[PDB]
Amino acid sequence: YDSADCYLDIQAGSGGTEAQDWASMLERMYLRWAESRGFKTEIIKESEGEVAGIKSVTIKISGDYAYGWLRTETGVHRLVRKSPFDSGGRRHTSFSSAFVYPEVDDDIDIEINPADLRIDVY
Amino acid sequence: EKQAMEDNKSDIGWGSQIRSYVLDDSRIKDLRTGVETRNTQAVLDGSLDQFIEASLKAG
RNA sequence: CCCGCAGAAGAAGCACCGGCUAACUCCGUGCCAGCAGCCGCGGUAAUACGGAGGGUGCAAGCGUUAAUCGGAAUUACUGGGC
RNA sequence: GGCCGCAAGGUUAAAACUCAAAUGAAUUGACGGGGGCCCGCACAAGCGGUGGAGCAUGUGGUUUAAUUCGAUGCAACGCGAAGAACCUUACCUGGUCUUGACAUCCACGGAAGUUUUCAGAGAUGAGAAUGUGCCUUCGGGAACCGUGAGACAGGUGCUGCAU
RNA sequence: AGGGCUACACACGUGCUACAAUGGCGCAUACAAAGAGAAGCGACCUCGCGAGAGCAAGCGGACCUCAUAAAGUGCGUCGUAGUCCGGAUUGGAGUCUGCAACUCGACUCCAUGAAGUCGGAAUCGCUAGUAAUCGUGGAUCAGAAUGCCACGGUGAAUACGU
RNA sequence: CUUACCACUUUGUGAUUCAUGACUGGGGUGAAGUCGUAACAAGGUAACCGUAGGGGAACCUGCGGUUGGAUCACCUCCUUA
RNA sequence: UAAGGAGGUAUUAAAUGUGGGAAUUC
RNA sequence: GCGGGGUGGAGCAGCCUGGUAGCUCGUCGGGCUCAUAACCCGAAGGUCGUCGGUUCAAAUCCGGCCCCCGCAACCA
RNA sequence: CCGACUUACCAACCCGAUGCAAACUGCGAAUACCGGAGAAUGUUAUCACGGGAGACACACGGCGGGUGCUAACGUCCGUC
RNA sequence: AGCCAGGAUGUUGGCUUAGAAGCAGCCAUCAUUUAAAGAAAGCGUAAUAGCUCACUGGUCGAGUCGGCCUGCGCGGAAGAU
RNA sequence: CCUCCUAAAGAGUAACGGAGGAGCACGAAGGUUGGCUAAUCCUGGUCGGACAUCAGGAGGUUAGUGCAAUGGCAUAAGCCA
RNA sequence: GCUCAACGGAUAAAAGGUACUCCGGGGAUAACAGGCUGAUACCGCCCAAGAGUUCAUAUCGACGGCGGUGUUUGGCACCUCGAUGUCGGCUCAUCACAUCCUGGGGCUGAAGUAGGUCCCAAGGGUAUGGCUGUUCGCCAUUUAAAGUGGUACGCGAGCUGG
């Protein structure tokens, strides 16, 4: 399925609000990379964190071998930076997950072959 | 199939990282391939081609 | 048990070194790999992980685990409290 | 489980598992939509503004080959910058060099220079005239230009959470 | 060397200029302080509508130059209108600096003549020579201030009280 | 040979203990989720205890009890020395 | 000046803040 | 078979009686705050299920088609 | 602001050719119907007025049709 | 009709294919040797191969071929005393 | 109740056959006299556009009829006075 | 002066239940069975795109077409309403063949074993239980096989009565 278009799902993780901000950063990064590759992106769904960032986002990527180019980014991305959401400015670690799956073709509806059915009347 | 994929998805937490972005040390390292860069700003701006090409070449 | 023969010739390892607890540095590593009796150690300048040099303690043994008592006055008779 | 109760429940009374604490009093602070007393354009009493408009200027964001980098509650945002056409400039595109634009040392040459020519966007490359001096045991040497090495130079590269 | 740092659907901060009559315009005419100056300040005179140009004094300055302060005052006009308010934008023609003003300088002349008629929620500064308003100079600097630093002119209101 | 006693063995019905069971109750734990903010200050309606009712949840309300609750300043008037 | 008694004072509103913190010690 | 419905992102109005789309939340911009919520000041967003007809003109009236609801579906 | 090219392509009107129609007709029968004339034939077979009714569940066959499945010994019309 | 000869060459036409030789296709589909021999009509081979065959010659010596209109028949054609 | 078809070229003709309308309107929308001729498209033209009003051309009732359908309507039954 | 619109208008004035029921009638008219039909149902055949590595026809067979049976659900309302008792079971059957087993054959993508598919063949044979009133069906375990149907969905003047 490397040639097919793909869907990218980003979900915040252990960092909490910092994780949601990191998820927003990852979303911006992947959108910029798609622009650089010339692929077309749209936002199917999004859930924004209340304080900052996004809790989750689903993006559709369309292009030549989009799934092939993006499939290796699936996993959890670890971020280490002085959390802007800590009063003491401590160095916290946040986690965000990117999952890439191909755009499945719509199934052809198959009518029930009448030779596959047994009908009983009683 | 979807539920098997959800159970296969590693939890978003400690120890499940495959790409570490440490901004204080100004280092980004991919755990799978070992590719490491210091231009964190470029990578955040979208210079993912190095990591993606490395992963594809590794296969 | 004794006498004679030959040549240093045949004979040293194990644990530990952050505190408790005797014994410290370099390199690797980078909340990973790992350690851990307790407190804890590791997130890129680690005497705590792993290797090395040095050192400390024991020794044909040295460590780990299991077990009992001690320390535990932590069932207090000796010998406690409300 | 037992006993008691009409019931609600009472009474008696564990274990597994888990943690390295839980706790009492007092001490120094900090905090209180606790108290008291003071003060400050803090209110109050006023005057003039900002938020609307056009323009300037910084920022963010976006864009871009690059839009260099930093500042980014009060205490960043006409801030570093008391002044980006070139230079600046640290950025980008292209063209170029590799002991080197900037130093010291060694060797080797050539005074320093000055004037030109050509080619190139320029860096630069090639050539042609012209001076060949100053200290000076005719040993010279060194002001200065090159060439050849290698110790080195060089970096406004990262870490202001090592200073 | 050329380009970018000057981009531009947009959001914010800090500024300048206004929305007029306590004003605009025209003529005339008073009163400052502080400071800069030698690859500099540059008088005068002549030319140009003008920015400026040519020639050329003086001054390392209480001496010469920058360099008439402006608000003000007197007279006249405008008579309330998007105006004789506003001066953005744009076209044409120029000047100067600088090798070089296309990207991307400032200034001048002619034309043009936008929004804006006192600004929602909200928010700022100031207690006296202060606020407000009016000019002037300096550094940085070849050229390039509404920014900064400084200097004077006029010159208030209010503070019951906590 | 017979009787008595008696082992194996058989039947019925209980007790106890171990394992197991669809489902169900609560408990402990967690480097982030969702809904609130119940306590700690007078924690913004003092808190807590017994009991009862109600409510997504911390909880609320009634009745009685405890202090293991904070504050207690200031103005005016009158009287006495 | 001291003591006692009485009356008035008073904010309606105000939820929340994840996860990486001691060199200064013979 | 007989009735209803289908309208900004969500839930409801507007239909009857043709001329015109409203409310609440939500979204976006600016405030307040150290910050978020709450709160305050502003904006935007539906050509009305889908076709067709009728009309000068249709969210509205009529007819199909699709989806959703109700009822009914009996004696047998 | 203009606009330039090209077409997997789709095509109104118009022109040429080919069909279709219960609710189409620039055409159009056979029959049937109305009226007039004439002969022959018919026990007036015709009409009017009066007395007495019955009947108003039809069936099949033919032809022309609606409906149904160009089903029914189906159903509903027209006509013998 | 049989029957006897034959039934060649470039050349396996190339591509795509896994292989593709007439015979998976795609894809061209020609000229040469001439009596004639298809870049193949069928069978066949994993592919070839092989087997035919179309075409053509030679012996035997009168019909032979396959459409059109039409009459009568045949199959299709299974049920319960 | 009205219009068309079924309905077989006179009238009439059924079905829970196929399609639609009516339960009004108008003192002018009636009477008469005089006059007039449509839809639609094309070209040109201020705002003005696919579509307003104006001018010309093509066309010839494809319009119109107060309201369904049918039959009519130019001598108009249509439009104006 | 009437939506007397059930529009030749019963009255000025009117809804339902009856499985507690009753009378007069109707096979003029439904429920069962028969009849006509055959849409549907079941069983065949025609064409051959394709599936089957190649290869339409070993086995299947799309888009379409033509039949047979009566055999389901129906249509009609011809018989019976002065009465033709009904699902399943039980007992007892009888016939058809569109054959489930045993018999005979053709082709096979038939090595053998074991199958597939079609043709001939009706002599004989062709389960017991769990659940349910069940038919049907699922399940357990057998068998060479546990056939498909007609017979008023055979059979209550033979039984049962869930």
Ligand SMILES: [K+]
């Ligand atoms: K290292």
Ligand SMILES: [K+]
């Ligand atoms: K004791």
Ligand SMILES: [K+]
């Ligand atoms: K009770």
Ligand SMILES: [K+]
């Ligand atoms: K401003």
Ligand SMILES: [K+]
């Ligand atoms: K410092």
Ligand SMILES: [K+]
């Ligand atoms: K400014």
Ligand SMILES: [K+]
């Ligand atoms: K410029």
Ligand SMILES: [K+]
């Ligand atoms: K003007």
Ligand SMILES: [K+]
């Ligand atoms: K303002």
Ligand SMILES: [K+]
């Ligand atoms: K200057």
Ligand SMILES: [K+]
């Ligand atoms: K409480």
Ligand SMILES: [K+]
């Ligand atoms: K309390």
Ligand SMILES: [K+]
């Ligand atoms: K609830």
Ligand SMILES: [K+]
């Ligand atoms: K009579």
Ligand SMILES: [K+]
């Ligand atoms: K008839």
Ligand SMILES: [K+]
């Ligand atoms: K007729």
